[PDB]
């Protein structure tokens, strides 16, 4: 019951909205694909 619908082109948009931090994080990735924080 799952279908796809086109949503746009894959393009860089010059002068786009800019936001978000850039944290540096120690992480572990387990067999289930789950990331977790490590110290």
């Amino acid at each position: 019951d799952m279908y796809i619908e086109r949503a746009g082109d894959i393009t860089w948009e010059k002068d786009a909205e800019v936001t978000g931090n850039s944290p540096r994080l120690d992480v572990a990735l387990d067999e289930s694909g789950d990331f977790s924080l490590v110290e």
Partner: protein, 151 residues
């Protein structure tokens, strides 16, 4: 068939469960979006071809085609396709997931769950990974790995 970014919808009412990338005739999304189920595209059907729960990635109709990677320096753009919104580009400088197997770029952007699978782009417009597998650091501050496969 045409290249681009796509909504992944499910059928009362239609819900958007994810996003994916069509490129070189192969559809790319994250595994947790579809769990590997077949997809319909028009009258046609798209069948899973490769998948990996650890990478949380799946490709349809062919092998994974995206191989661009973050350069570790420049800003990137999340091409977020939120449910009920038109596609929009969010520019950001990625953080880093430091792991035993090396560094992975990560974007500190928190969009609705139906946006999982949205592509992250480099300055040349190449898909460097997909959005929506990551971690929470403190009070629902979600950070997504820039998840890329192997071509």
């Amino acid at each position: 068939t045409t290249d681009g970014v796509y909504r992944v919808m499910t059928r009362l009412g239609s819900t958007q469960v994810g996003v994916g990338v069509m490129q070189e005739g192969v559809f790319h999304t994250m595994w947790h979006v579809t769990k590997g189920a077949a997809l319909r595209s028009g009258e046609g059907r798209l069948d899973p071809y490769w998948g990996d729960v650890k990478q949380d990635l799946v490709s349809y109709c062919g092998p994974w085609k995206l191989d661009a990677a973050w350069d570790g320096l420049s800003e990137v753009q999340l091409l977020a396709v939120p449910p009920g919104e038109r596609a929009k580009n969010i520019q950001t400088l990625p953080g880093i997931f430091k792991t035993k197997d090396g560094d992975i770029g990560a974007v500190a952007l928190d969009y609705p769950a139906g946006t999982s699978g949205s592509p992250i782009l480099d300055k040349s417009g190449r898909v460097i990974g997909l959005y929506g597998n990551g971690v929470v650091i403190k009070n629902g501050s979600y950070v997504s790995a820039i998840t890329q496969g192997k071509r």
